[PDB]
Amino acid sequence: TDKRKQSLYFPEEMLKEIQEEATRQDRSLSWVVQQAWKIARERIKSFPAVNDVTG
Amino acid sequence: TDKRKQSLYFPEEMLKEIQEEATRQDRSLSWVVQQAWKIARERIKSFPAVNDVTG
Amino acid sequence: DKRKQSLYFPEEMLKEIQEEATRQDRSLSWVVQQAWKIARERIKSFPA
Amino acid sequence: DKRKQSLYFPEEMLKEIQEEATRQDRSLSWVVQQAWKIARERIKSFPAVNDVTG
């Protein structure tokens, strides 16, 4: 859980939205993205492997 | 919506989980994080500004 | 069923593979897999 | 100058790569690099499948 730097790419519109959400809570970009992963984690892990027959 | 590169920081455990989710769908890291934002966007935007009296 | 293999690439080629992966919102492994499928026959043909 | 990268392969495809490497007294990395050189142009020419402008 020690921090690791990772470069990602975003559509400008999505990045802008993430930036405004960070600013609104006096928070870092990475923080808002981390909270989004905590909210989404379970839907994303539960979805089957789309290209694997067994999934 | 043209792509923009942004460096973020993650706890190693969360990054590892994002990486395994990307791999499982033969997908990029940025893609899995984008799908998480689409899922979380609405909870995060709806939450009041925690430090602003009016929020 | 998937198996992990470490390979070596010249930095320029790796960068090119990465930009192709990014352009299709795809993983590195995916781009390389599609390249094998495309090249398989030229590779099998060229001499021993 | 070279970089090590971990990749994932279906066992059948990896096995095929391995047999091709052996047949030419070549490394795995070499055969995969030659496959990129051959495929590069088809792959770059194919449009961005998710982008309207492509």
Numbering used by the authors:
A (entry chain C), B (entry chain C): 4 to 58
C (entry chain B): 5 to 52
D (entry chain A): 5 to 58
Which sentences did the original study use to describe this structure?
We show that CdbA is a tetrameric ribbon-helix-helix DNA binding protein and changes conformation upon c-di-GMP binding. Consistently, c-di-GMP and DNA binding are mutually exclusive. In vivo CdbA is essential, while CdbB is not, and depletion of CdbA causes defects in chromosome organization and segregation resulting in defects in cell division. CdbA is abundant and binds globally to the M. xanthus chromosome. These observations are in agreement with a model whereby CdbA is a ligand-regulated nucleoid-associated protein (NAP) important for chromosome organization and segregation and in which CdbA activity is modulated by c-di-GMP.
The tetramer centers on residue F50 of the two innermost chains, and the C-terminal tails can be traced five residues further than in form one, and with the C-terminal tail of the innermost chains in a dimer contacting an opposing dimer. Protein–protein contacts mediated by the tail region include a hydrophobic component from F50 and V53 in one chain projecting towards a pocket in the opposing dimer formed by W34/I42/I47, a second hydrophobic interaction between V56 and P14/M17, and a more polar interface between the free carbonyl groups of A52/V53/D55 and the side chains of Q38 and K41. The arrangement of the two dimers in the tetramer places their β-sheets ~35 Å apart (measured between Cα atoms of equivalent Y12 residues). Using the RHH protein Arc, which binds DNA as a tetramer and with the two β-sheets separated by 26Å40,41, as a template, we created a model of how CdbA could bind DNA. The tetramer interface displays different hydrophobic packing between the two crystal forms we observed here, suggesting that it may have inherent plasticity that allows it to undergo this change.
